[PDB]
Amino acid sequence: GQVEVFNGQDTRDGVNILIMGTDGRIGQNSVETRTDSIMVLNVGGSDKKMKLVSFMRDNLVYIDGYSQVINGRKQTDNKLNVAYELGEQEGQKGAEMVRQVLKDNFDLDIKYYALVDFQAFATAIDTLFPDGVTIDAQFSTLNGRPLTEATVGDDLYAESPTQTIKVGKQQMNGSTLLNYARFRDDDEADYGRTKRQQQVLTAILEQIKDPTKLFTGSEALGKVFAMTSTNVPYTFLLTNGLSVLDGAKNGIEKLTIPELGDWVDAYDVYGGLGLLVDQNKYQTKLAQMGLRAAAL
Amino acid sequence: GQVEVFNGQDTRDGVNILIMGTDGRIGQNSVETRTDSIMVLNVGGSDKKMKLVSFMRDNLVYIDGYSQVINGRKQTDNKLNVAYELGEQEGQKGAEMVRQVLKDNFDLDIKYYALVDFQAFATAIDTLFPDGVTIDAQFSTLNGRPLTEATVGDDLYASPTQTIKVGKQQMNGSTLLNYARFRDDDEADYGRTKRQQQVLTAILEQIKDPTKLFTGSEALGKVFAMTSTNVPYTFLLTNGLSVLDGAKNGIEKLTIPELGDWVDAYDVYGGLGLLVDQNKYQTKLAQMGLRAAA
Amino acid sequence: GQVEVFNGQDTRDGVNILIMGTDGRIGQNSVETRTDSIMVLNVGGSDKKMKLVSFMRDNLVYIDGYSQVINGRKQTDNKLNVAYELGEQEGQKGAEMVRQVLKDNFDLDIKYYALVDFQAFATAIDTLFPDGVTIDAQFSTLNGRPLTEATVGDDLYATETESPTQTIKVGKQQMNGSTLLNYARFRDDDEADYGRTKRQQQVLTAILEQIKDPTKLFTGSEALGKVFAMTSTNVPYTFLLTNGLSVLDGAKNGIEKLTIPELGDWVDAYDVYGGLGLLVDQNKYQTKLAQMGLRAAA
Numbered sequence: 071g072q073v074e075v076f077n078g079q080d081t082r083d084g085v086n087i088l089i090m091g092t093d094g095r096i097g098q099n100s101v102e103t104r105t106d107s108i109m110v111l112n113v114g115g116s117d118k119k120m121k122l123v124s125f126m127r128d129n130l131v132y133i134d135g136y137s138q139v140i141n142g143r144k145q146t147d148n149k150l151n152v153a154y155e156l157g158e159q160e161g162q163k164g165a166e167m168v169r170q171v172l173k174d175n176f177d178l179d180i181k182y183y184a185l186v187d188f189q190a191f192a193t194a195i196d197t198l199f200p201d202g203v204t205i206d207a208q209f210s211t212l213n214g215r216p217l218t219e220a221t222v223g224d225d226l227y228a229e230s231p232t233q234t235i236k237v238g239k240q241q242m243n244g245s246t247l248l249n250y251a252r253f254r255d256d257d258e259a260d261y262g263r264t265k266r267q268q269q270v271l272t273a274i275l276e277q278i279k280d281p282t283k284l285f286t287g288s289e290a291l292g293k294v295f296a297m298t299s300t301n302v303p304y305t306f307l308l309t310n311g312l313s314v315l316d317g318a319k320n321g322i323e324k325l326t327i328p329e330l331g332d333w334v335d336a337y338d339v340y341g342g343l344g345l346l347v348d349q350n351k352y353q354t355k356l357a358q359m360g361l362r363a364a365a366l
Numbered sequence: 367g368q369v370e371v372f373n374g375q376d377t378r379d380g381v382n383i384l385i386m387g388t389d390g391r392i393g394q395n396s397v398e399t400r401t402d403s404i405m406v407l408n409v410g411g412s413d414k415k416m417k418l419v420s421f422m423r424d425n426l427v428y429i430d431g432y433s434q435v436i437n438g439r440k441q442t443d444n445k446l447n448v449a450y451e452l453g454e455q456e457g458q459k460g461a462e463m464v465r466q467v468l469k470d471n472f473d474l475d476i477k478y479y480a481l482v483d484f485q486a487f488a489t490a491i492d493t494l495f496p497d498g499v500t501i502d503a504q505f506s507t508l509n510g511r512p513l514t515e516a517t518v519g520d521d522l523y524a525s526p527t528q529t530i531k532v533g534k535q536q537m538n539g540s541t542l543l544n545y546a547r548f549r550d551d552d553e554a555d556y557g558r559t560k561r562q563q564q565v566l567t568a569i570l571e572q573i574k575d576p577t578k579l580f581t582g583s584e585a586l587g588k589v590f591a592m593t594s595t596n597v598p599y600t601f602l603l604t605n606g607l608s609v610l611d612g613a614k615n616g617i618e619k620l621t622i623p624e625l626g627d628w629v630d631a632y633d634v635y636g637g638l639g640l641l642v643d644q645n646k647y648q649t650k651l652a653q654m655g656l657r658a659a660a
Numbered sequence: 661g662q663v664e665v666f667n668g669q670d671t672r673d674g675v676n677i678l679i680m681g682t683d684g685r686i687g688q689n690s691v692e693t694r695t696d697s698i699m700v701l702n703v704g705g706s707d708k709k710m711k712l713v714s715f716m717r718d719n720l721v722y723i724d725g726y727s728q729v730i731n732g733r734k735q736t737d738n739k740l741n742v743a744y745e746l747g748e749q750e751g752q753k754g755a756e757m758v759r760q761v762l763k764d765n766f767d768l769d770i771k772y773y774a775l776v777d778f779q780a781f782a783t784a785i786d787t788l789f790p791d792g793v794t795i796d797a798q799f800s801t802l803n804g805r806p807l808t809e810a811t812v813g814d815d816l817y818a819t820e821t822e823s824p825t826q827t828i829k830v831g832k833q834q835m836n837g838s839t840l841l842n843y844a845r846f847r848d849d850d851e852a853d854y855g856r857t858k859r860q861q862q863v864l865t866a867i868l869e870q871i872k873d874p875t876k877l878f879t880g881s882e883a884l885g886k887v888f889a890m891t892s893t894n895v896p897y898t899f900l901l902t903n904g905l906s907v908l909d910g911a912k913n914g915i916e917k918l919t920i921p922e923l924g925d926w927v928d929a930y931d932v933y934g935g936l937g938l939l940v941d942q943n944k945y946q947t948k949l950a951q952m953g954l955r956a957a958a
Contacts, residue, residue: 082790140630140638143630148630191514274590297901298678332632335436335439335441335630337443337632337636339632341636346641364790364791365786365790365791365836366792366834492784506688507686509661510661510662510684510748510777511661511748511752512745512751552686553686553688570929618823624821624822625687625689626819
C-alpha cells in the first residue's frame with residue numbers, strides 16, 4: 071500500500087526494480103492486502119537488453135527473524151508471498167521485506183520498487199488505453215487437453231461473477247486484462263500465471279503511444295501515478311523511460327524462478343505446501359542474465 | 367515384535383536381509399516399540415564380499431496408503447522409522463512395511479528380515495562373547511572439538527550413564543549396545559549408523575568356532591529365542607561359513623543418505639526429516655550390487 | 661574452533677600473529693589432521709616490511725609432555741600439526757599449544773592468533789570478493805613434466821564414498837572461495853607441501869592486496885562482520901583500527917616470505933607414530949628468524 075520504506079541497493083549491471091501486484095482496491099492497503107505477483111525488472115544493463123524475472127509466490131525462502139535455524143542451517147520454511155504481509159504488519163515494510171528476502175535467498179540487489187493493487191491496475195489501463203490492450207490470450211493444457219478458453223473469477227465485481235476469456239489476439243480492457251493475468255487454473259498453475267503477468271507487462275510497455283508526451287505532462291499518467299506506490303525518481307524516468315519503452319518492443323528476456331517442474335514440494339512452518347528450490351543454481355542463472363553478475 | 371508377516375523377494379546378486387534393532391525389552395508390546403537401526407545386508411553375492419547399507423531413520427519416504435499424492439506426485443512425507451510403527455499397529459506388519467517402503471523408495475528387493483530388541487542384543491552378546499567384543503571406540507567431533515570419551519545413557523538400567531573412552535577395548539553387551547546407540551556428536555545419527563555397522567561387522571568377524579550352528583549350542587538357541595527372523599535354518603547351514611568368511615574379505619559399507627547429502631523438510635506430522643535424492647542412491651545401491659540394475 | 665585460550669607474548673620488533681587454516685569438514689571421513697596451514701605474520705617491525713613465515717605441517721617438533729626424552733635429550737618426535745589436535749583435546753587450547761611449541765622449538769614469541777576453517781574461508785571470500793580474487797595460478801613439475809593445469813580435490817563437496825575434483829589452469833584468473841581454497845590446498849606436484857606453503861602465502865598476500873576501501877572496512881561493513889563471525893581470533897579491535905591500513909599497505913610494499921624448512925633443507929625421519937616428517941636444523945632457522953626481525957634475540 072501507498073507508503074513503503076525501501077533501502078534500495080545498486081547492482082553491477084543495469085538497475086533492478088522490484089514490481090508487485092497486490093490484491094487490495096484503491097484505498098485499503100497494508101494488512102488487508104496480499105501479493106499476487108512478484109517480479110524483478112533489470113533495465114540499462116551494458117548488453118542493452120531488458121530482463122524480467124518472476125518469482126513464484128510459493129517459493130520457500132529464509133525470512134530472517136521469522137524462519138527457523140536448525141544447527142547452523144537456515145531453513146527456507148516460509149512462502150515468499152508471506153514476506154510482504156509480514157512487512158505490512160511491521161508497518162509500511164512490505165516492499166522492503168520482499169527486498170531483504172530476495173537479497174538473502176537469491177543475492178539480488180534491488181534499487182527501486184513499484185506496487186499496484188488490482189483496482190488501480192484496471193482503472194489505470196482504462197485511462198491509458200481507451201481501446202484496451204492487444205493481447206494474444208494463451209493457456210496451457212488441463213490434464214493434457216488443450217484449452218481454448220478460461221473461466222476467471224471477476225473479482226472486481228462483488229456477489230461473485232466470473233468471466234470467460236477465449237484464446238487468441240484480442241483487445242482487453244483493464245478488468246479483462248487483470249483477470250487474464252490472474253488466471254492459474256490449468257496444468258501450469260502459478261508458473262503459467264507468471265508467464266501471463268510477464269506478457270501483460272511487456273504488452274503495456276510496447277503499446278504505449280506518444281511516449282514523450284507522458285513525461286512532458288499528461289493528466290492520464292498523473293491519475294495512474296496517484297494509484298501507484300513507487301520510489302522510482304522522476305529524473306530516472308526522464309533519462310531511462312523511452313529506452314525502456316523501446317527496449318520492450320525488441321522484447322524482454324524472461325525467466326520464472328523456479329522453472330516449470332524444477333522444484334520439490336515441501337511444507338512451510340504453517341503446514342502449507344511450497345516449492346523447495348535450488349537457490350544456488352538460480353543465483354548462477356541470475357548472474358548469467360546480468361541481474362547480479364557475480365563469481366563466474 | 368516376535369511374529370511378523372513378510373513377502374520377501376529375491377535380488378539378482380546375493381540375498382538382501384533387512385536387519386532392525388528395536389527399543390523394546392525381552393518380551394514387550396511391539397506396538398509400543400521403536401526402530402533404533404535400519405540396515406540391509408547382502409550376502410552370497412558373486413564377488414564373495416558382504417555389503418551393508420544403513421538407512422538413516424529420518425529419511426523422508428513415500429509410505430503407500432499413508433503418504434499424500436499431489437497432482438499425481440507421490441510425497442516422501444513420512445519418516446522411515448514410522449513405517450515399522452505403522453506396521454506393528456496394523457498387526458505384525460512392521461518388517462513388512464519397512465520392506466514395502468525400501469522397495470518403493472530405493473527399489474531394493476529383500477528376501478529375509480531379522481529383528482532384535484536392545485535387551486536381547488545385550489544378553490545375546492554376553493552369552494556368545496564371555497570376554498566381550500573387541501571394539502576400537504571412535505567418535506566424531508563435538509562443536510569441532512575432538513572427543514576422547516563419550517557419555518552414553520545406560521538405558522538398560524534406566525537413568526544412569528556410562529563413559530566410553532576412545533580406543534581398542536573389550537565391550538560387554540550393555541557397553542556395546544550403548545556404544546551403538548550413541549549419537550551425541552557432530553555426526554548425530556549418521557555417525558551412529560557407522561558405529562552400528564562397526565559393531566555388526568565386529569560380531570561377525572569375532573565369532574569363534576561357527577560349528578556350534580551344526581553341533582547345536584544352547585547359547586545360539588538362547589539367541590534365537592530373543593530374535594524375530596524368517597531366515598530358513600538350512601540357509602544358515604548352507605551359507606553360514608561363507609558369510610563369516612566373507613567378513614575376512616571386509617564389508618563394503620554405505621549410509622543413505624551420506625553425511626550432509628540431504629535437505630531438511632517437514633513430515634506430515636510437523637517433524638523434521640531428510641529429503642534425499644533417491645535416484646542417486648538407487649544408482650549407488652546398484653553399483654554396490656544390492657540392486658544390480660546395471 | 662571458536663573459543664580458544666591464548667597466553668600471547670610480545671616480541672622485541674613488530675607483533676607476531678599466528679595464522680592457521682583448519683579443516684572443519686564435519687566429515688571426519690574428510691580429515692587426517694585438521695591443521696592445513698601454519699603461518700606467523702610479523703607486522704609493524706622496524707624495517708618497515710611485513711614478514712610471513714610458513715611452518716611446513718610435517719615439521720618434527722618437541723611437544724613438552726608428549727615427546728620423549730632420551731638420555732636427557734628432548735626429541736623432535738611429533739609432527740607440528742599434532743600440537744593443535746592435542747590442544748583441542750585438552751580443551752580449547754589448540755592455538756595455545758601451537759604457540760607453546762613454536763616458542764619451544766623456534767623461540768618465537770607470538771601475541772595474537774587468527775583461525776579460519778575451510779568452509780568459513782570460502783564463504784568469507786565470496787562475501788568480500790563478488791568477482792573473486794585475482795590469482796596467477798602456478799604449479800611445479802610433476803615427475804619433471806611441466807604442468808599447465810592441476811587436478812585438485814574439491815574437498816568442500818567430498819563425502820566418504822565420493823571425491824569430486826576441479827581442474828585449475830595455470831595463469832592469471834579470478835577465483836571464487838571454493839576455487840581459491842582448492843588452489844591453496846593443492847600439493848600434488850614435485851614441490852609437495854613446500855609448494856603448497858608458497859601458494860598459501862600467495863593467496864593470503866593476494867587477499868590483503870585486493871581489499872578495496874579499507875577505509876570503509878573497519879568502520880562499518882556487514883560483510884566484514886559476517887567474516888568475523890566465521891573466524892576465531894584474539895586480535896583487539898583497536899589494534900585493527902590503529903594498524904589495519906598499515907598492514908594492507910605493507911602488503912602492497914611486498915612481504916618478505918620464508919617457509920621453514922626451505923625446499924630440500926631437511927632430513928626425512930619417522931615420528932613416534934611411524935609417520936614421516938621433516939627433521940630440521942632449528943638453530944639455523946632461529947638465526948634466520950632473528951635476522952628477519954621475528955625474534956631479534958640472542
